[PDB]
Amino acid sequence: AVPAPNQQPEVFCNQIFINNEWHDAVSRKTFPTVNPSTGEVICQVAEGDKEDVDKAVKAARAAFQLGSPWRRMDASHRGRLLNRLADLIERDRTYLAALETLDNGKPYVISYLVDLDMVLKCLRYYAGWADKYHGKTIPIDGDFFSYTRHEPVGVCGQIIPWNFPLLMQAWKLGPALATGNVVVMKVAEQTPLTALYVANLIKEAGFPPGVVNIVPGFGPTAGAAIASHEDVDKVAFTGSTEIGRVIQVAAGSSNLKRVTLELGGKSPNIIMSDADMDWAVEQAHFALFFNQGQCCCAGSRTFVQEDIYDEFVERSVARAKSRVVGNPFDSKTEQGPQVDETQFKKILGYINTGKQEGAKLLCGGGIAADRGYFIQPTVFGDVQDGMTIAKEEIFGPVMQILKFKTIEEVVGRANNSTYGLAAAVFTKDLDKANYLSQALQAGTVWVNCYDVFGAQSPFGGYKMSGSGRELGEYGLQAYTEVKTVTVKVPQKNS
Amino acid sequence: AVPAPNQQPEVFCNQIFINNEWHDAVSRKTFPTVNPSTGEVICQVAEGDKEDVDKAVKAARAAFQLGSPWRRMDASHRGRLLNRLADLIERDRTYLAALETLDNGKPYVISYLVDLDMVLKCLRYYAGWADKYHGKTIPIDGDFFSYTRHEPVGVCGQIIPWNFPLLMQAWKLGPALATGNVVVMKVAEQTPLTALYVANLIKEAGFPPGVVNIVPGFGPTAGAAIASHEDVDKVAFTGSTEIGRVIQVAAGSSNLKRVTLELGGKSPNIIMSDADMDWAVEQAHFALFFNQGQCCCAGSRTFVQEDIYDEFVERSVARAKSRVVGNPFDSKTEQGPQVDETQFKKILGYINTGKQEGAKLLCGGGIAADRGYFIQPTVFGDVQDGMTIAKEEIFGPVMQILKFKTIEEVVGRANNSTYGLAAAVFTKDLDKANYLSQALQAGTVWVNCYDVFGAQSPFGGYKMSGSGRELGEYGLQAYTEVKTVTVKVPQKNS
Amino acid sequence: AVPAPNQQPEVFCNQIFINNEWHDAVSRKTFPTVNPSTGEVICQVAEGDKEDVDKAVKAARAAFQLGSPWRRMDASHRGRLLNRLADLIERDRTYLAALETLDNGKPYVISYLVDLDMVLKCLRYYAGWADKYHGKTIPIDGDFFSYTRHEPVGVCGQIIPWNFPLLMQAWKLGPALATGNVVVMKVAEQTPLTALYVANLIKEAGFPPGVVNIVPGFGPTAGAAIASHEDVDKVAFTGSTEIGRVIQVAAGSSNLKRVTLELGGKSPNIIMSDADMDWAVEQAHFALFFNQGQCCCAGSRTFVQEDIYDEFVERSVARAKSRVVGNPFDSKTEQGPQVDETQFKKILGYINTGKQEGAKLLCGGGIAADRGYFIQPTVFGDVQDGMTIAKEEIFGPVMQILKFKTIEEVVGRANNSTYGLAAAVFTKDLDKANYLSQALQAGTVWVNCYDVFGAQSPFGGYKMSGSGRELGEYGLQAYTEVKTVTVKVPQKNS
Amino acid sequence: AVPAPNQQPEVFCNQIFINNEWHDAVSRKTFPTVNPSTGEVICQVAEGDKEDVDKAVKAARAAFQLGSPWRRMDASHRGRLLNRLADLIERDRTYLAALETLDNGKPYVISYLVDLDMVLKCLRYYAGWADKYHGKTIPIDGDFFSYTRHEPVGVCGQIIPWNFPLLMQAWKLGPALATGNVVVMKVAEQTPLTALYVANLIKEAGFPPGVVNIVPGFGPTAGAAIASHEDVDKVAFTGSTEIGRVIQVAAGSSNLKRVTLELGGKSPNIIMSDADMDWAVEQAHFALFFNQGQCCCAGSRTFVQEDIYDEFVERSVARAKSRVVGNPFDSKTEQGPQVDETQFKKILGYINTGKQEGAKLLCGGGIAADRGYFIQPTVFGDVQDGMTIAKEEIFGPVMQILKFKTIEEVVGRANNSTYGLAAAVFTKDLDKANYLSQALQAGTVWVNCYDVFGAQSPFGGYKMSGSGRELGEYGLQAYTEVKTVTVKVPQKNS
Numbered sequence A, B, C, D: 001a002v003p004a005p006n007q008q009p010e011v012f013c014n015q016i017f018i019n020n021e022w023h024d025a026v027s028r029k030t031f032p033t034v035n036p037s038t039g040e041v042i043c044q045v046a047e048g049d050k051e052d053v054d055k056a057v058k059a060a061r062a063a064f065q066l067g068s069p070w071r072r073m074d075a076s077h078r079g080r081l082l083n084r085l086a087d088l089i090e091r092d093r094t095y096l097a098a099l100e101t102l103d104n105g106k107p108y109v110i111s112y113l114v115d116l117d118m119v120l121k122c123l124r125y126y127a128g129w130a131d132k133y134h135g136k137t138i139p140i141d142g143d144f145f146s147y148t149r150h151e152p153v154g155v156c157g158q159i160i161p162w163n164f165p166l167l168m169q170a171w172k173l174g175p176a177l178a179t180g181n182v183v184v185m186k187v188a189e190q191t192p193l194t195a196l197y198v199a200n201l202i203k204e205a206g207f208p209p210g211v212v213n214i215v216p217g218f219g220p221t222a223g224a225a226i227a228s229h230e231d232v233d234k235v236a237f238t239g240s241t242e243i244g245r246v247i248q249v250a251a252g253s254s255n256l257k258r259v260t261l262e263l264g265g266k267s268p269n270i271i272m273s274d275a276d277m278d279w280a281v282e283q284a285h286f287a288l289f290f291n292q293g294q295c296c297c298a299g300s301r302t303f304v305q306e307d308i309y310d311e312f313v314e315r316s317v318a319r320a321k322s323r324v325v326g327n328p329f330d331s332k333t334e335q336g337p338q339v340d341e342t343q344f345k346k347i348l349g350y351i352n353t354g355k356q357e358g359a360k361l362l363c364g365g366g367i368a369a370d371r372g373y374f375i376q377p378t379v380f381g382d383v384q385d386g387m388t389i390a391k392e393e394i395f396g397p398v399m400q401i402l403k404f405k406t407i408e409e410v411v412g413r414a415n416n417s418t419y420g421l422a423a424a425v426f427t428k429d430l431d432k433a434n435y436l437s438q439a440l441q442a443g444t445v446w447v448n449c450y451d452v453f454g455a456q457s458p459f460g461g462y463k464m465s466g467s468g469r470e471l472g473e474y475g476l477q478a479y480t481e482v483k484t485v486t487v488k489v490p491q492k493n494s
Ligand SMILES: NC(=O)c1ccc[n+]([C@@H]2O[C@H](COP(=O)([O-])OP(=O)(O)OC[C@H]3O[C@@H](n4cnc5c(N)ncnc54)[C@H](O)[C@@H]3O)[C@@H](O)[C@H]2O)c1
Pocket: C159, C160, C161, C162, C163, C186, C187, C188, C189, C217, C218, C219, C220, C221, C222, C223, C224, C225, C227, C238, C239, C240, C241, C243, C244, C246, C247, C262, C263, C264, C265, C295, C296, C393, C394, C395
């Protein structure tokens, strides 16, 4: 039961957020944000750059000073604030979901039932961690009392992507705020709206000025300014592998700020011959096509055992052909447009590459509508490991199905990648499930399911899919600076 | 690769161990310890009673005084001491294994390869815990600095059974010593020898006097004296459910000392129709017949799915018939005698009960030799839940095989018990394994295996099979007294 | 800032709470609950006995069945429910505070600003734990996958005292519910009202029927029925050392249910010569007189160094004399009446004992009013260790001041007790503070403060002050049943 | 009790260690390692470069393959191997200490009693962690079973400095091996000898070929090769801030390997007016002069309160003048030479800068001997925050004494630095100690002591002194790659 959306949500926030106030870019420049469903401009947004980031960092540093309201605040109260923010987001759930769809393109039903639900669960999960991430009292040698204080890392720069606007903001703000840090966030230029509105809710919830600062703008400008800043203590980035390298290089070239990266992937979804056919087919479809295929851990490499290959392919093709593409605001729409023209073109280019390299086009392969950035659900059969569409992150509704014979074979082929964000295994066998989940080199291995995220469970990549983990208890590690205090005592006893 | 045993090991220790010295009982009384393989007396052992326990408790209390060598000793050094004890036990491995067999009756090969190996692995594991069981620094509300000190619980009374003499001693000493406690141990009257010799090694290792005290003697005397003592802070008991109740009542009646119990069981071993027949058969055999069937978590209720029942039974009977019973010192012996005459007769009474109640005797059922306490491997088929041999812990080589149809059925029947120490599931199906492991009400659930103990994994019972857990990190909880220190500070900051 | 109270709050709940419904006792019997400020009957309350407890246990067991709404509920949702209950309690904060004062006697201002605040903080803290009390994946030896499930302990019997009605209920419900257990609570016969109203809010919050059941009644009847019940998995008791013993004996005599106890104390408050005089005097007053002296960890033994003894006593006596005693609803009242006539008389008997044993009566010592159960703030000087008022828990506004010379002397004198609930040290010296906090044998050691409780910090006693800990992460241990699952895998790898 | 040293220990190892075998550099080139005490060449050492690192990485990768001896080895056995290595290092303690002194220059007595003792304590500590760094079982939403596997991070490149050759090797090998990783270590060109010999002991201990590989050589060559390698999963570096940046940039430019850094410092040692004069003076001396002043956390900024400044300075100057400089093998020597000519000159240059900037030279200031790299213990008084010697890491026996008035003042001045490795506070006041320890922006804050390291307590820097922590449990974080396994189950229950 999803509330009727407002297909034309009003925009109340489109500037730079510093000290709980709205500012125009120092340059006074603005950039347009487009609605992918029509190709039309929604509104202008302040174009933050280096000078704006500088104002944001100073505000955050000021809010982080010893003795400030944010630093003195009870840990439990930080939890109270996070829950309040969640309550406020829930109050405006219908509006935010609509605005999310307008600027991103994903179906409103999904924005409401999935994106916003996950945002609420993430913030509420971390609210609980606020006063529970204990330090330790250590039984060190000699006559000493030794313990550790889990302090905030400090001024945290957070650069996020456009595929899950609200959710990426939550995954970042949740752990940072729970541990008492201050934030300078750089939202994606393609989807700045929903994040900016949430800043209004952050102010309404009671967060002190400067605790959360959002600077909308481009990457090489605002993004690089944050990564290279001399007064930013830590940076958390989610995006392409290419930019992740630039982020880490910026960190090492500047003040050696701490770094955590959540990059792309080319996750393998392995279907064994003993899998439940109907379930595997539907899950494999979801694994790749979810969120217009714009998911970091998308099952972009569907390995299917030769005994069930033919049947699996027929069913997969049928499902892809029945996948409804249209206006995201229509409750019947399963797939909306791609985020922008750049992604639109990049995906079409990959489809063309797939055709040239010898992959078998089974369905789709072209534009789905003359207005917007809609692409037909595309499925390639008989894909070989050496093919481009088998090695590069397409980030669109383009499925690759590969055939394999043995379990040893598939392990080597699945792990033969520079990526290692996620992986999946579909089987009814206990030993095969354990054998594969142990052998697969990925941050997350789903068994008989896919895209199962939980605020409780860690998520991150192996190899070049990133470093560090987000969500769960692990998501607090990167936002904590450990201090050891060793005190001389008259006589130590157990 | 088992060294030739000394079939008549010399006894060097047979008195009360207090303050790293050997004492006769105050009463000067002694009791005989018998060799179950011949029924002959090995030697006399000091019969400790209340007055002897009192001397041991005072010695322990003195060793636990603030400022004592044991209290001031670095946590890491306690670890060094435990590793030293392990090394000494390894030096005398061949001797201890032989002595273990002589007094307990289990096969020498098993004493050497299993019991002693596990003892070594238990002590070495806990040695590593000595300086790693951290306390916490807590982000409490207000201007305070709050933290916890994990202190030793104090004088720990440890009462152990006779089925695994050396191992039960290790499971008790390892965690207690790693956390800096002092001990007053009451070993079983049937097998006091090996534990007493280890006391010599404890002294040789460098442990301060009074840290470990051992009082051989009977239960209602020495055992009850420890459980009811006004100066014993904690008691850990391993034995029958009947005595466990007595221990807990004694604790409540005395000084409210902390209690942890490891009692009996009637563990169900579930064999699904899709299990590997050969494997399940051999494992089910081991699950019940191990250590003359004198194992707390023995799979005494073998549930077999109707479609594979007949074949499973035929193979089970054949294996039981081929099981070699004889002199424990003979390399070909799989099963030695029962611990003593009391157990010998108790088991025969159960076999008679099984015949009278209608269970089908498939093999064995009687005495295996005219000398010693040897009983033929016995297997009962078509056992029903209401039968005595299906509800009561037999503790002998008596196997119960029950038939079942559905998975929902077996769950209910397996959980329909006052016991809940362990359980096992044999299947190749992922979902069946996960379904059963979650549903079964047991402290340990083995999947496609049985009797897999690891110093790293906890062991304990649900319901009336005990309370608390031993082994792993959990094994330190009961030996730790938590102290909170909350300090007023000028101004708290995150 | 305190809202004007309704000095005559209406009672809406006075029956037995089972399956979210109100029931009369099977016997139809009722008992009167008195207002200690007037000695008049507030109303009648259903007198629950064994048969009523049986209905409660069965309902709880039913709500705990595998596949039930409570068992299947997401852990995070349990957190949501706990936060909802907290919100409902805050909505009715003014009403609950008034009702607390009416039935207990403590000052309304304190009920509102302290009791209810602490209740809200306790529930909100534990709501955050609901989905974060992780189990473990263990690197066990051999080819196995070993892990632990942290399951609910089951049907939890919770028996609470009358000194902090709402708070004791919160301390019990918070951790139990956070971990997925079901509850059968027995509230104190002297103060059943507030807890019963909270049951209504529990139903309003959405908790499934049978998750929380409250049975008002007496101890030897309803209380003993819970402790001795064959289907109660765990019992948590807070009360006298005398009844604690009875509970533990009942547990051992019945089904060996797990037990945690929170008993009395005779907590020492040590004031060193270098302490801040004004601060120590005020805190020492609060340490003992708080909540009409009806506090488990009351600083009933005030040790003062000889060089500051005379001045400390003069100031303490003056503070005691200025302490306003009267109607709890009057904002100027610091101290209300004692809970009932039984306590009233017991305290008067102790004051007489103090006079007879040679303690110097400095002020007070008699009845403060003709109506109600008011006792004058009483101070005894030159108290000796052997005196009864120095060894037994008075639980009234009776202060004992003892003189001491050295720091070594006070450690021995403070530790020479069967109690060990709490302790405190007042000093400006780093070494003295560390020396004492380590040496003191108490569950909580406050430094330069007293009665500082935090939902984040554990609380419990050493020796006969109880066993186990409440609050903090440690508060979840007793409500968790650990299950180890060890699965055989094809080939284990690190 | 120090055994007489062999002042001319024979060198047995001076090549590249790959696959438990000794190899010459592919280029066949060698470099000389000098004895700083005489300026003479000890021996030639294989000069490893990129090609040799490539051989090392491939061997490490091979040893890390799924199914290899190192991967299948029980975690507990990895602990057994670490303890064995520790025992072997202890067997050869006298020899290793002598060789440490010969190549590094530090006093033999210190090498024996401190360096080697700490090495032994580090390895034995981590040996215990091998099978205790548990993963988690998470109570995720929905019908799923979610858990994490704590897997080894992989091929770990470890680059270490020359100030503590053996110890730096222990701090790196202990955690890496405890968690099942493989290593390619690059020891300092100035002190390669001792580490190479330890490789012989690693082979003798039973560690599989390729698990530990050591490549002696220069930084821009061998070091850079490791940091930029496409198949190295993680790099741990200990050295200058300058090279730390190069390492992080190389990591971002190559394969985005994980990075942890342990850089330099300019640690403030604060002496309050109420400190114990004698103690503070002796500890301030040790704080700076330890290990010829070649300590990362050296107290290079001694802040002394004005009221005790003159007395503190007089005593400090007297202690520095009495400090015995000479042959490190002579028992009376407190200070040996600097590690090499480059450091020698760098330190002399800093002393010159101190004289030019206006700092008051109180003692020393020049060369202590005509042979070797000996520098007189130098003390500068009246140092100002803006002076070069007050901002840059000198790494020599040059002490800076600065005067201050208030506690608020010293906090600001102590924190006004790009470094933040450690700090110290000397005071008898509880409040001041807690105020300062909380306020100071440093990885380790010592109270009434200094240079107190424990294998149990974390060590690392804030700001530019590094990132991540070493030692303690935290030391395992960087050598662990978290994997989440989420399995669909029929029906999830608590
Ligand atoms: N430890 C504490 O925090 C605490 C709390 C309250 C009172 N006390 C001590 O207890 C003394 C007496 O007061 P009290 O009568 O209210 O304590 P109590 O132990 O008798 O009552 C506490 C709770 O236990 C229940 N209870 C009583 N008998 C029981 C039994 N036989 N089986 C099961 N439950 C039973 C009572 O009904 C009540 O719910 C006080 O003067 C004080 O010394 C201690």
